[PDB]
Structure 1
């Protein structure tokens, strides 16, 4: 009973999240892919753990 005058749900936060994806969303993608490169070699003739 009674409408949600000032009471709201985090739907705007979700829409903002999608929009914030530029800074925040790609941040996780950028970090989680580990662009920093964990292996110190990479430029190595042999080294793929096989």
Structure 2
């Protein structure tokens, strides 16, 4: 009856002369409850 945790946690890091770029296409949940 209870779902729980829905976590999307995107995080980026880089260091020490590194290079870092990105682009997200699509991201998301899609969730549902039934009871009868």
Name the one with the larger helix percent.
1
Moved over 6 A (4+): 1-4, 12-34
Query: Gapped runs of 5+ residues in structure 2?
Result: none
TM-score, normalising length: structure 2? 0.11
Relative contact order (C-alpha < 8 Å, sep 6+): which is higher?
2
Aligned residues between the structures = 35
TM-score, normalising length: structure 1? 0.11
CA RMSD of aligned residues (A): 17.7
Query: Gapped runs of 5+ residues in structure 1?
Result: 35-49
